């Protein structure tokens, strides 16, 4: 009767029932149990070419916390990151005792602007604790400059929360990265299991450390010898994870289809000619359809107009982090571009089961 | 063949499959979904006489973190707690930016000694940020004096991680407490579902706030207005929790029976006469069987002796927190009793399915 923003569809119980019965037989239910290891092994084989290492975590927000806590420089104070990201990103930083320092984004790709970033690193020197870029909207943010940062001794944790399963040229996003990449398996993201996350790194020793950190910093004596907490993923989450890997081809194909319908219908209804624009990026996997509305149109009015037509759009990210109550006083560079994107950005609905006619009803409402 | 220390048995899949069908039909998988709400309502009615409020969390460690972060006095530096606790407790404080300050325990009930705690509150004054007692080994640590601290403006968050389901005179442990109580649903704890936890308070508004904190500090506009992170429990975890509520009488009966057998066999084999002693408490629900070995016996000799008889005991908590690498340099009162109890404490196996003949094996081995 209406078009909601979110309609999650995780794999149904029949797809992971075998695994539930293995769990019941084994009487191991969490703490890096066999199903969790099998899930990690499957991911390393199917996505990461058996190079590097992964660990599951209970959610991507805990993964950011763990990665930042492990990798931050001891004497640093700031986590250099975009304001144009989900609040989880600066929150993970603050829980690690760091202050966010917001960096402006490019107007076209919506990633942190590397020119500004480099300049800020040069200026802050030892005050830089860590650099936390966001691979905006599950897209192909090239990591070449970030890999260079790691090699110069500036640690990098990439927030790719919504980008798991993003492939380009047959390579999975993040492959062989020196730093850490965090992905989310939240039910609302494309690889959605309910609650869950993953960390990848080419650095196997670092992944081994995060595994400890996720288990109270325990050594092999179950003695706490390093910072830690609990971010263990249960066997039950790993079970849905594994079943999701096996239906993933279908899901990726669904999203890709709906994405192409959006691009076609937008173009065919001449919305691009009216000044709507898509993100500039090589490759993306879409949680929703992000688009800039025309310069002369206020994005909150789009939301309101669509809401009259029974369609729920949203405004990721407006307010951006620097404009939100909690983060409004943290330092930043000039953020003119962020501010502009935050006035224009719209988030259009996209979920499994969406038909071409639904996309068309949305695209036509945009235009009228 | 070998008697292992832990042998978790969560309710089997058939017991929550209906709920899994509900989840699949609803397409709501997390973020305080209807099954999670049902679970919490079932707890409020079933355990807390519909007075106060609860929230699920992804695990008790994160619940501790949320609770301390909300309730800590903003000018304070220290979290006053026992050393004789699981490392999750001081780790939770350290993540909130506090230093643990360790307080000695009573030699008999093994709780934080209130006399020593009071003197220390009086000495530290504004430097006290929070008090975090542990209801050692799932027992009935009376909360009258802690309620008193709350009334005086000293915040208390009680770590009762292993004590969910603990009843005494028909009242659930923590009922009507003004502060917060954290409980765990880890698979190894008596009310075990995999990964999970719960927070109870008589203070409903505080619980509402914790809810927001565990969803990124979001208000109804999904804007971040307070410190927060992700500690949301999935619908799937709630599904198992609900099923665990229906079988809880069975689980509790099984554990009480095994405890009773332990007590009878220990007395009948003369072990009490030989200097072995149990916790002085009115009521306990048991994850394992804690016992002090005789003064002249080293508890770790008891471990190595049971070990070569195919029985895995452990030593919770030896080393105590103050003795573990990460926490050695935090301040404390004199800890003479904690040290003594950490030289004598032994953790004997107890799990669902343990037979009377298995307890007898064990108790007989203690007797030599
Ligand atoms: Ca199968
Ligand atoms: Ca049923
Ligand atoms: Ca039924």
UniProtKB/TrEMBL annotation, chains A, B:
**Residues annotated for Ca(2+) binding in this entry:** 18
Any one biological process term the GO annotation gives: polysaccharide biosynthetic process
Tell me the Gene3D superfamilies matching this sequence: Type I PLP-dependent aspartate aminotransferase-like (Major domain)
Drop me one GO molecular function for this one. metal ion binding
Residue numbers annotated as active site: 189 (proton acceptor)
Reading the lineage from the top rank, the first entry is: Bacteria
Q: At which residues is N6-(pyridoxal phosphate)lysine found?
A: 189
Keyword field: Calcium, Metal-binding, Pyridoxal phosphate
Q: Name one Pfam family in it.
A: DegT_DnrJ_EryC1
The family note in this entry says: Belongs to the DegT/DnrJ/EryC1 family.
Q: What is this protein called?
A: DegT/dnrJ/eryC1/strS family protein
The scientific name of the source species is Bacillus cereus (strain ATCC 10987 / NRS 248)
């Amino acid at each position: 009767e209406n078009i909601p923003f979110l309609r999650a569809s995780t794999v149904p119980v029949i797809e992971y029932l075998d695994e539930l019965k293995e769990i019941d037989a084994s009487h191991i239910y969490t703490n890096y149990g066999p199903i969790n290891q099998r899930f990690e092994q499957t991911i390393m084989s199917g996505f990461f070419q058996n190079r590097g290492a992964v660990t599951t975590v209970a959610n991507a927000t805990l993964g950011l916390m763990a990665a930042i806590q492990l990798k931050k420089r001891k004497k640093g104070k700031y986590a250099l990151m975009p304001s144009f990201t989900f609040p989880a990103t600066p929150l993970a930083a603050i829980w690690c005792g760091l202050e966010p320092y917001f960096i402006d984004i490019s107007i076209d790709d919506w990633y942190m602007d590397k020119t500004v970033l480099w300049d800020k690193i040069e200026e802050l020197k030892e005050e830089v604790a860590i650099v936390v870029p966001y691979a905006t909207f599950g897209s192909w943010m090239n990591l070449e400059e970030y890999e260079e940062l790691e090699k110069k001794g500036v640690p990098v944790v990439v927030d790719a929360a919504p980008g798991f399963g993003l492939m380009n040229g047959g390579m999975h996003y993040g492959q062989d990265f020196s730093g850490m990449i965090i992905y989310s398996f939240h039910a609302t993201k494309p690889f959605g299991i309910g609650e869950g996350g993953l960390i990848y790194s080419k650095n196997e020793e670092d992944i081994q450390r995060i595994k400890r950190m996720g288990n109270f910093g325990f050594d092999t004596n179950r003695e706490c010898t390093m910072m830690g907490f609990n971010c263990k993923m249960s066997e039950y989450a790993a079970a849905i994870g594994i079943a999701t890997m096996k239906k993933w081809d279908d899901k990726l194909k669904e999203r890709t289809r709906i994405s192409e319908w959006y691009k076609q219908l937008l173009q065919s209804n001449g919305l691009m000619k009216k000044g709507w624009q898509l993100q500039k990026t090589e490759a993306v996997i879409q949680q929703f359809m992000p688009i800039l509305c025309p310069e002369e149109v206020r994005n909150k009015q789009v939301i309101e107009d669509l809401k009259k037509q029974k369609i729920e759009a949203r405004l990721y990210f407006s307010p951006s982090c620097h404009q939100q109550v909690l983060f409004r006083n943290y330092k930043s560079t000039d953020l003119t571009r962020t501010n502009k994107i935050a006035k224009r950005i719209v988030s259009l609905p996209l979920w499994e089961g969406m038909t071409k006619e639904i996309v068309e009803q949305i695209v036509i409402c945009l235009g009228q």
